């Protein structure tokens, strides 16, 4: 029922220079595997978390341009898709919920844009963004904390990593104002 109000004009809108690996509909079919994102609270609830999951992704992934770390120096699960998804372990849980073979073949994450897709909503629905934005009281900070805590919250101001997280409340507050919801009080971390 999300797709009411982000309708693909609305996508297209947030993401003009998406790379075209990147649809709205291998979204909406990502987004079936998990039947509780943006169906979970009020009407402003469901807009909240979409605003919040699209906001994230869009500073995670440069505007959806980002398939794949191009120069990686590490191993092989190095970051793919729109959440730069990394690193063994998260290829391995990510891989056994979504019954992905993301262990042995971590390139489908790169080749198949529903796996994408399917990893970053894993990610959401797994680490609990999606019951922190969904709360009574809602907290688009608590999804920064639960991403990418590490880097972007409790730095200081001007820094690199503050920059990141006001980034974030800057394209979460921006989709909310497309949607005509309030974005809440709890933005920054």
């Known amino acids: 029922s999300w797709t009411s109000f982000v309708t693909p004009a609305v996508f297209e809108g947030w993401f003009p220079n998406r790379n075209p690996f990147y649809t709205y509909d291998g979204l909406v ?7 509780e994102f943006g169906t979970t609270g009020s009407l402003d609830d ?11 992704i869009n500073q995670a992934s440069g505007g959806l341009q980002f398939i794949q ?7 092989q699960y190095y970051g793919r898709g729109p959440i730069q998804l990394s690193w063994n372990y998260n290829y391995g849980e990510a ?3 979504l019954g992905l073979d993301l262990l042995n073949n971590p390139d489908l994450v790169a080749q198949d844009s529903t796996v994408a897709w399917r990893t970053a909503l894993w990610f959401w629905m797994k680490r609990d ?3 922190a ?3 009574s009281p809602p907290s688009f900070s608590g999804t920064i904390r639960i991403i990418n805590g590490g880097l972007e919250c409790n730095q200081p101001a001007g820094s690199i990593g503050n920059m990141q ?10 989709f909310c104002q497309t949607l005509g919801v309030d974005p809440g009080t709890d933005l920054r971390c």
């Open 69 to 75: 770390e191009q120069n990686p120096q590490s191993d």
């Open 165 to 174: 997280m006001e980034n974030r409340v800057t394209y979460y507050t921006q």
């Open 46 to 56: 469901q807009k909240r978390e979409l605003a919040a999951f699209l906001g994230n």
């Open 95 to 97: 891989g056994a919920d």
């Open 29 to 35: 079919s990502a987004s079936n595997g998990y039947p």
């Open 129 to 131: 963004c999606h019951g």
């Open 133 to 135: 934005i969904t709360a």
